[PDB]
């Protein structure tokens, strides 16, 4: 994940 | 349903769930599940991480087969029990594993 | 567990070649599946699944970190075979398609 981020 | 489960606390509030979880040490992975007081069809996974209690909304969905999800159906579970057991082994979108049940 | 071995999609110790016969005999539809005990890995299980009219075989091994079952060396972990099967009826995971229809005994 990355902050502010929808990557999962 | 998973209504016979010790980690299921029914319709308790966010603020009470934070009290219960705090009263048991505020350690990572301490958790419970409750019925949402804001989304009536939904449930909430209340989880301790970094001395903070976080709340994960769980919504139901259906082609007429019901499932539960915390991520708009990207990851889907047959029931709350499977959702809880899965996240005891896999982090998924959660910041840490579900470790200790906050009982009652 | 004992309960998992009682499920209609669990065929105990039938063979790969037999598993491929059963699945073809019920239509070769995507997601048609069964679970069997491995004849090659004694502690393992195999998920046999129909996809694109071909039967593919996914090995399932137990591990301990708490005990679990996995098809991908612990990248996705399941409490039991039932959880693995019910999970893959809704999520593709590493499988080419969803587990749709049970190939019953």
Curated annotation (Swiss-Prot), chain C:
Domain called SH2: residue spans: 9-103
Outcome following mutation: residue 87 to R: Abolishes dimerization. Abolishes activation of HRAS
PTM text: Phosphorylated on serine and threonine residues in response to heregulin. Phosphorylated on tyrosine residues by TEK/TIE2. Phosphorylated on tyrosine residues in response to NTN1 signaling. Phosphorylation promotes stress granule disassembly during recovery after cellular stress. Phosphorylated on tyrosine residues by PTK2/FAK1, and possibly also other kinases. Phosphorylation is enhanced by activation of receptor kinases. Tyrosine phosphorylation is essential for activation of down-stream protein kinases.
Effect of residue 58 to F: Global loss of tyrosine phosphorylation. Abolishes interaction with FHL2 and HAX1
Highest taxon of source: Eukaryota
Annotated effect of mutating residue 68 to F: Global loss of tyrosine phosphorylation. Abolishes interaction with FHL2 and HAX1
UniProt-annotated location(s): Cytoplasm; Cell junction, Focal adhesion; Cell membrane; Cytoplasmic granule
Residues annotated as site: Important for dimerization and for HRAS activation: 87
Oligomer and partners: Homodimer. Interacts (via SH2 domain) with EGFR, ERBB2, ERBB3 (when phosphorylated), ERBB4 (when phosphorylated), EPHB1, INSR, FGFR1, PDGFRA (tyrosine phosphorylated) and PDGFRB (tyrosine phosphorylated). Interacts with SHC1. Interacts with RND1. Interacts (when tyrosine phosphorylated) with FHL2 and HAX1. Interacts (via SH2 domain) with RET and PTK2/FAK1. Interacts (when not phosphorylated) with ELAVL1. In stressed cells, but not in normal cells, part of a complex that contains at least GRB7, PTK2/FAK1, STAU1, ELAVL1 and TIA1. Interacts (via SH2 domain) with KIT (phosphorylated).
Domain note: The PH domain mediates interaction with membranes containing phosphoinositides.
UniProt function note: Adapter protein that interacts with the cytoplasmic domain of numerous receptor kinases and modulates down-stream signaling. Promotes activation of down-stream protein kinases, including STAT3, AKT1, MAPK1 and/or MAPK3. Promotes activation of HRAS. Plays a role in signal transduction in response to EGF. Plays a role in the regulation of cell proliferation and cell migration. Plays a role in the assembly and stability of RNA stress granules. Binds to the 5'UTR of target mRNA molecules and represses translation of target mRNA species, when not phosphorylated.
Assigned protein family: Belongs to the GRB7/10/14 family.
Name the UniProt record assigns to this protein: Growth factor receptor-bound protein 7
Organism from which the protein derives: Homo sapiens
Lineage: Eukaryota, Metazoa, Chordata, Craniata, Vertebrata
Location of this fragment in the whole protein: 423 to 529 of 532
């Amino acid at each position: 994940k990355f902050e502010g981020x929808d990557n999962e | 349903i998973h209504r016979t489960q010790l980690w299921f606390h029914g319709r308790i509030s966010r603020e009470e769930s934070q009290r219960l979880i705090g009263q048991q040490g505020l350690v990572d992975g301490l958790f419970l599940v409750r019925e949402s007081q804001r989304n009536p069809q939904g449930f909430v996974l209340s989880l301790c991480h970094l001395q903070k209690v976080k709340h994960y909304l769980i919504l139901p969905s259906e082609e007429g087969r019901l499932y539960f999800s915390m991520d708009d159906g990207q990851t889907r579970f047959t029931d709350l029990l499977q959702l809880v057991e899965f996240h005891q082994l896999n982090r998924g979108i959660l910041p840490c594993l579900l470790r200790h049940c906050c009982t009652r």
